[PDB]
Amino acid sequence: SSRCLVRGSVNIDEFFHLPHIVRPGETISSTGLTKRAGGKGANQAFAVARAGGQVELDGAIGDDGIWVKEMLESAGVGTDKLKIVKDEVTGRAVIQSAADGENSIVLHAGANYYLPSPTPTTSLATYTHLLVQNEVPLSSTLAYLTAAGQSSPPLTSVFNPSPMLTPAQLREFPWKHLSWLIVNEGELGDLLLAFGSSANPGEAKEDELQAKASAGILELHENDYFSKNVGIICTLGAKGILCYEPGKEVGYLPAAKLQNPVKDTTGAGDCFAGYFVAGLMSGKSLQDALKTCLVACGICVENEGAMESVPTLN
Amino acid sequence: SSRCLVRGSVNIDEFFHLPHIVRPGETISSTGLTKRAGGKGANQAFAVARAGGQVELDGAIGDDGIWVKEMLESAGVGTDKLKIVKDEVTGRAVIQSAADGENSIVLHAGANYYLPSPTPTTSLATYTHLLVQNEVPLSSTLAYLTAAGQSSPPLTSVFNPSPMLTPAQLREFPWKHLSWLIVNEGELGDLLLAFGSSANPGEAKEDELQAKASAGILELHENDYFSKNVGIICTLGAKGILCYEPGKEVGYLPAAKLQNPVKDTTGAGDCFAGYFVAGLMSGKSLQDALKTCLVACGICVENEGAMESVPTLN
Structure with missing residues (x-):
């Protein structure tokens, strides 16, 4: 019976609405501020739960984040391993939401980089799937992935390298333990660049992107660092x-058609990741799991919050 | 050219002098309090330096521990990677120094469990030797040991499991990356017990100890968890x-004869470990490196501080 452990972050997201991303030396006034539950770990756990999967989140918050812990619990996310740290603050994402631009995010780790003393036993015995990102200490992500890959049988592990790892960290990462890598085209280019390739699908034109990213996947597969x-x-x-x-063909799926204007894509990638893992756990074929992901995160981009806009299974 | 990285702890040791170790429910008055620089990482780094080895310490203190950082620097220990953490305290060992008993130690991790965000690249490029213990987050110790074992060529890594790991952690530890394990007879028994053996050299009589510990080493060597x-x-x-x-014979060396009364053995094991690593780095034969260790830590047990009593190379 499938059960996912998310070892990852919880953030209080602060969306500062701005006419443009602030430039070096500039002072600019936000037009509004919106606070929402967020974080790579919480967003992805919330999406696994909304998609119908059994999921637990392992990480830490401060007292000021208990309302996020309560949201996670109301969605069915297990939180026994979501520690509340005295005299620490919940991690924060300071998000500049530009009127006419990509957003920009500044992370403050806070409790996401807390590790309790002494280091306790962490068993993966009840889990079939592991989801990890990069908003907690890398050594902790490495430890959980290694434990997942060395279990008998190995867990299905899924990694989203966000924020991006340093090139040396990418080259030393234990890829052999990882079942699935989830990236966007710019993160694909980051890996290829760290691995000595001159391919960078993050720079392709929108018309050439499918072709360049497909070749980049096949190149990454063969790369000795991977x-x-x-x-x-x-x-x-x-x-x-x-x-x-x-060893198989690179498959392509187009994005679902939108039914409401694109509002905010923060956590749309996180939505996709959690729905993908829930699709892996459901026994669905890979093609069916992916088609469902596409419908879900399309709904997600139509609404405002990283956690709030994750749809239910429909 | 040999260079050791110590990834480990720094403690402010507080020695509370007591007639006996306090028992559950008891209130007892200490007769004196002595504060000294300590910690498994700092003690062992200090000993490598006093023994003549090039050594760097990677870890963290609070503002209140800068005087320990300055002691380390005055002994030649490199401290570029010894981070000073704002709004954190240096880790502490609360030591009950019993008049007629073994001492008892309570650790407070403090800055020893701090990890900076974002997680930076750590290169082992300049190092030939790694020394690790267990007073920092285990995932960090695991990460450094794994990097050491996967380097080209692998570093010589030396591990002292103090404080002891949980049995599950011992069974999952990446022993294949480790060059040297340093234990006392009770820690040897802890591993054997965690690995399903009924051997426990920690319970042998003083006359049977050499025999039982020798057999325990040979048993540990063959154990599939190791x-x-x-x-x-x-x-x-x-x-x-x-x-x-x-694959070789278990060798036995008697302890050097004492020339002053045994005062305090705190860090005597740490002294031994650092002198052993310095002996590995010096190009000395193993038998010569061990003989020097025995003379050094014999001097060390004659004096009071974990760091202060580490002798110079003589």
């Missing part, structure tokens, strides 16, 4: 997604 | 030390 055992999902925004299982 | 590539040093207190290289 591992041939890793499946790859590369999101291409509104231009769809690419899916690759080791 | 690794056949790990050399073992087992200290037996005043009864000497045992040394084992994979």
